[PDB]
RNA sequence: AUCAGAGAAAAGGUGUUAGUUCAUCUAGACAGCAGGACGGUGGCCAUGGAAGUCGGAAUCCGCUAAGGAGUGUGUAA
RNA sequence: AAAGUUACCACAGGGAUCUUGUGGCAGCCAAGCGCGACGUUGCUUCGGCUCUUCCUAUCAUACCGAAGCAGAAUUCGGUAAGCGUUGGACCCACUAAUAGGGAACGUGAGCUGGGACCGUCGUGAGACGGUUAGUCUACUGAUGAAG
């Protein structure tokens, strides 16, 4: 699902036309009548026979491109499901999967058909007939192709999440400062809007601490977007990393958001619980000031025990002739006394003797 | 088949009557020529639809559809005209003036700002500070959710960090310099209001007085 | 890869001839001229 | 990156300098290439183009019209299953007809009963040969009646005829 | 020729063209 | 049609002569010279008035006269006001370093996408290029020729092109942020 | 005619030339500049939301010189 | 008493002897000229080695266009035949790639592999014969008289 690599799916009458078009300039176009009728049936079989063979790879290629969703880990397959409705899409998969079927049972036909072929044009026509059928065929499976494009879209861009590692999950109200954490703790920039649910997908950010990796990952404020940060928050080995607003500046009580906790507490059970006290200048309860960006540091190191305890030549050469061109002079590096003796050249070899050997 | 520009075409199905539009304008013309007293002139200004609509709410209608059409169709010859010395009257009725009922103190003293437009000339020589733009020239106690301003606008700006900043700083009008187009548009997309509506009650169409004076 | 009637490689190589060639070898062949 | 990343690109960064203009221009002169298109294209993606442009005025031509309103010895054909001196091959051998109701209008697979008979010839009836204008009975029973063939099926490869009533 | 094809045609050609110009 | 005319007003510009189809145009600014042999246009000059004059031409050959009307009107604006081209540097990471020689007839570009290749451009005749000081990485293309100076700058803008890479996030590049007169 | 000239046919062409018909036009033809392009109303639903322009039904209206329950871009809106 | 019939027919005889990429059928519309286009509803003996060139309907190499095309790796589409397109047994591995074709009997005077009549005995059936009958030129280099 997350690994994406898959091609781009073309449209129904785009498709069409690549497979037509592949066939036609593939297989060869000139059969006249002084041919003989096993050659002009030939000459059609391996016309249709070209046309169910493109057919087939495309099709197979995108069946294949799509991930199984039950082979998929449990929260990469409830994301899947909340945020692109993966019944529809099985249902859209087996129904391109039973149109290739029905598609090389038509080839089948038709090529059976035409062994027996009788003349040129009974050959033609039986040509024709099963491209039209094929033809038929796709742009009957027309809106499959395009829910397939728009959830290999969504797949492409969807994280790369990895639950296996040490992650530290930020879920709680909307703009409680978690996210404000999460940008700075990670390389990530997760942006950040005065309107609610800003940050309607997850973001995954990687970091690291004591010689170790950590996987922040940000949830959308807490709709789909809720739903999606449940499920992913449901099946994580993380530390829950929720931020209650202390000086409630974040539009949320601090009663509510002690509701939501205790709400959410079912998710978070079985993991590090943090209570970050948020805009305190404006469960292990840490006090980290929103405004002042105060204690986000100490948060997420104590956040990181909690989880650990729970589981030059080179210039001078690019200046002078750059690499590959320039020729560096041993000589000059030389412990040489005398600069004259060390520059000059003496003999290897004279007479028949080796004079460095000798002397 | 030729060498034509082509033609575009639309869905609103909003088109107007035309010479039948321009006959009803007339027509309503006349009507107001006829009608009681307070023999205004005055249609429209550089203001826009909602100071016309606000002016026209303190009456019992300006209306004079197209310039010098009402002139026309009444007819330049006093005998044509319905009024009286029409002939020198005519010359003078020109651009955006119509009839209404209802005020003269109100055109002479109330002039409600708006904003300019291009041809005129601005009374003073704004200057747009450098760096990030400002709304409202630095009076509000300017969001930075602008950004299709930038590509909008075509000065020189740079989107930076998802805000416009200028590099340098360029004046949007100077002081006895018409209005160009880039100036009206820049202050009209600024808080810039170098504009007074204004009336026009030289003379007066009395039935019984008919003297329409050019003061 | 290009050939040797590569457009951009005729370019460099007339770049390069003003560059690693040319100054050094006319004076070469006016040494051996007043020689 | 995470879900639309140059989308953030595009809002933290802005678009191509002259994009707008580009875009602008390459519409403004899609008028020029699509006359040049016309005349200078050649082959099978000419006649591509031609009939891709036919469509498009046909379909324009009535978006226009709906605006203003609102404003050996074998058998060779296709058949059905001494006597049998020919040989009758099984591909060819067909045994679901497509028949399409003429009142109801609905296309119905429905199994060959049988061959009422052929006009070409009583032998081909007798070898229940299916041609164009055979007689051939099918079951009705979900919709036995008897219905023509209208179509070639040696020549479109499927049954098709079209029911008698 | 000049473009790809010859346009002086075949005598038998010729004819059968004139013959299937009257059919 | 039997006549087909189109009249231009002259301004203090010198000499105008289009003597054997070669416009000489001789201005304050400098002398321009352009050949419209290509064009079988009658060039009628009188007092301040030079008239284009076809007659009994078909269509194809009746656009060209205010083909010609346009670029005689262009070469006099550049005897008289001149044309600059004012293009803004666009860097992501990588600053493109921009040099100068012969009082700027070529450009040379380099650290362009970090790339170790020195572009080097040279402007059509009668164009200067210059460093703007009151804008950072502005380069100014001014000059007599209008052709010569937009040509001058689709030629920088075509050498820094940016390929293989999405267009869409990748701005890097030249472009012409500005087109107009001298003053 | 960058493949001139001495059945493949249904068509395509911002290729040219004549006509045929119908339309506007000093009440100002097109085209271009300078503007308006409004008020109920964010009509009614829809959903993180869609204020004419996610979308589904309505398609009313006062004012005018004219402004749609909106031509598209755009906007998270 | 036999007679009709045979397209269920069988055994002998006589006569005759341009091509490529869009399915069909049935309806609803349907610009228009009873048809009626685009749209819309249904349902489904041959066969292959070498070789020479040639075509491009391009597998690779070169350059562009588009696509949620971040990068990389791709996919699709243009110009393009200059240059290539293996080694072994549906494979296999290498390879940048292991593209499709023509030389109408590709190159069998480059190359190789995987009877007829008559008679006789004959029911619905098949065999045991007598005759028989084939048909200088071009290129590669080498001299060479001569205004």
């Known amino acids: ?359 | ?215 | ?35 | 990156p995470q879900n639309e990343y140059i989308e953030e690109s595009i809002r933290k960064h802005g678009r191509r300098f002259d994009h707008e203009e580009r875009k602008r221009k390459k519409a403004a002169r899609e008028a020029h290439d699509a006359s040049l298109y016309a005349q200078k294209t050649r082959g099978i993606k000419a006649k591509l183009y031609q009939e891709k442009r036919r469509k498009e005025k046909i379909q324009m031509k009535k978006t226009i019209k709906q605006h203003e309103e609102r404003n050996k010895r074998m058998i060779t054909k296709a058949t059905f299953v001494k006597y049998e001196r020919f040989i009758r091959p099984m591909a060819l051998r067909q045994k679901k007809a497509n028949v399409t109701h003429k009142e109801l209008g609905v296309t119905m697979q429905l199994p060959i009963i049988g061959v009422k008979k052929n006009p070409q010839s009583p032998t081909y009836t007798q070898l229940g040969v299916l041609t164009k204008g055979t007689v051939i009975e099918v079951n009705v029973s979900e919709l036995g009646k008897y219905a023509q063939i209208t179509n070639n099926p040696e020549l479109d490869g499927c049954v098709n005829a079209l029911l008698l009533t | 020729s000049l473009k790809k094809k010859s346009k002086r045609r075949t005598t038998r050609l010729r004819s059968r063209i004139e013959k299937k110009a009257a059919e | ?183």
């Open chain 3, 1 to 35: 890869t290009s050939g040797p009637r590569d457009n951009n490689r005729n370019k460099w190589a007339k770049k390069h001839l003003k560059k690693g060639k040319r100054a050094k070898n006319s004076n070469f062949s006016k040494f051996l001229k007043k020689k």
């Open chain 6, 1 to 183: 049609d039997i006549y087909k005319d189109e009249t231009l007003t002259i301004p203090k510009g010198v000499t105008v002569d289009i003597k054997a189809r070669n416009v000489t145009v001789t201005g304050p600014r400098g002398t321009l010279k352009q050949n419209l042999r290509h064009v079988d246009i009658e060039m009628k000059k009188q007092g301040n008035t030079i008239k284009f004059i076809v007659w009994h031409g078909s269509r194809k050959h009746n656009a060209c006269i205010r083909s010609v009307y346009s670029i005689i009107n262009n070469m006099i604006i550049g005897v008289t006001q001149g044309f600059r081209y004012k293009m803004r540097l666009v860097y992501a990471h990588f600053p493109i370093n921009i040099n100068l020689t012969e009082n700027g007839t070529v450009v040379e570009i380099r650290n362009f996408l970090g790339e170790r290749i020195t572009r080097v451009i040279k402007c059509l005749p009668g164009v200067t290029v210059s460093i703007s000081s009151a804008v950072k990485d502005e380069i100014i293309l001014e000059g007599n020729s209008l052709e010569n100076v937009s040509q001058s700058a689709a030629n920088i803008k075509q050498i820094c092109n940016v390929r293989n890479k999405d267009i869409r996030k990748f701005l890097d590049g030249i472009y012409v942020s500005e087109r107009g007169n001298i003053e």
């Open chain 2, 1 to 215: 088949p030729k060498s034509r520009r082509s033609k575009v075409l639309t869905l609103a199905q909003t088109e107007k009557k035309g010479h039948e539009g321009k006959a009803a304008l007339f027509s309503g013309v006349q009507q107001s020529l006829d009608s009681f007293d307070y023999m205004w002139i005055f249609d429209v200004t550089n203001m826009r639809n909602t100071y016309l609509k606000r002016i026209r709410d303190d009456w019992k209608r300006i209306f004079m559809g197209k310039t010098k059409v009402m002139a026309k169709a009444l007819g330049h010859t006093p005998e044509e005209e319905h009024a009286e010395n029409v002939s020198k009257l005519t010359k003078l009725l020109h651009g955006a003036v119509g009839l209404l009922f209802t005020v003269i103190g109100y055109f002479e003293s109330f002039v409600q700002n708006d904003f300019a437009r291009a041809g005129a000339v601005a009374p003073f020589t704004h200057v747009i500070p450098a760096g990030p733009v400002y709304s409202r020239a630095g009076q509000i106690p300017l969001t930075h959710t602008l950004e299709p301003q930038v590509r909008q606008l075509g000065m020189p700006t740079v989107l930076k960090n998802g805000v416009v900043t200028l590099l340098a700083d360029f004046p949007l009008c100077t002081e006895g310099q018409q209005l160009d187009s880039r100036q009206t548009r820049l202050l009209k997309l600024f808080g810039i209001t170098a504009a007074e509506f204004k009336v026009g009650l030289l003379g007066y169409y009395s039935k019984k007085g008919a003297s329409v004076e050019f003061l």
């Open chain 1, 1 to 359: 699902a997350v690994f994406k690599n898959i091609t781009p799916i073309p449209d129904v009458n785009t498709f069409l036309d690549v497979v037509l078009s592949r066939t036609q300039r593939k297989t060869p176009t000139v059969i006249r009548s002084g041919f003989k009728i096993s050659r002009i049936r030939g000459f059609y079989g391996r016309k249709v026979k070209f046309t169910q063979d493109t057919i087939t790879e495309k099709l197979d290629s995108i069946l294949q491109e799509f991930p199984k969703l039950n082979d998929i880990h449990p929260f990469h397959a409830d994301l899947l499901n909340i945020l692109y409705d993966r019944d529809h899409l099985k249902i859209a998969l087996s129904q391109l999967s039973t149109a290739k079927h029905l598609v090389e049972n038509v080839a089948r036909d038709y090529i059976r058909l035409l062994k027996y072929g009788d003349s040129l044009y009974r050959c033609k026509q039986l040509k024709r007939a099963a491209l039209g059928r094929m033809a038929t065929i796709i742009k009957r499976q027309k809106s499959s192709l395009e829910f397939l494009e728009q959830v290999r879209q969504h797949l492409s861009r969807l994280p790369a999440i990895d639950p296996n590692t040490r992650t530290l999950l930020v879920c709680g109200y909307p703009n409680v400062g978690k996210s404000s954490f999460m940008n700075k703790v990670t390389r990530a920039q997760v942006d950040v809007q005065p309107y609610a649910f800003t940050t309607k997908s997850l973001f995954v950010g990687h970091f690291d601490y004591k010689y170790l990796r950590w996987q922040v990952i940000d949830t959308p404020g807490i709709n789909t977007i809720e739903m999606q940060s449940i499920t992913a928050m449901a099946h994580l080995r993380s530390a829950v990393l929720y931020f209650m607003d202390l000086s409630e500046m974040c539009g949320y009580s601090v009663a509510a958001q002690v509701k939501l906790y205790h709400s959410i507490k079912p998710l978070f059970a079985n993991k590090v619980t943090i209570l970050v006290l948020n805009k305190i200048d404006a469960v292990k309860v840490v006090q980290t000031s929103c405004v002042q960006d105060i204690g986000v540091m100490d948060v997420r190191t104590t956040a990181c025990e909690a989880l650990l305890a729970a589981r030059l030549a080179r210039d001078i050469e690019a200046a002078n002739g750059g690499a590959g061109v320039y020729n560096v002079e041993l000589r000059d590096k030389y412990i040489l006394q005398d600069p004259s003796w060390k520059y000059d050249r003496m003999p290897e070899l004279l007479d028949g003797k080796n004079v460095a050997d000798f002397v």
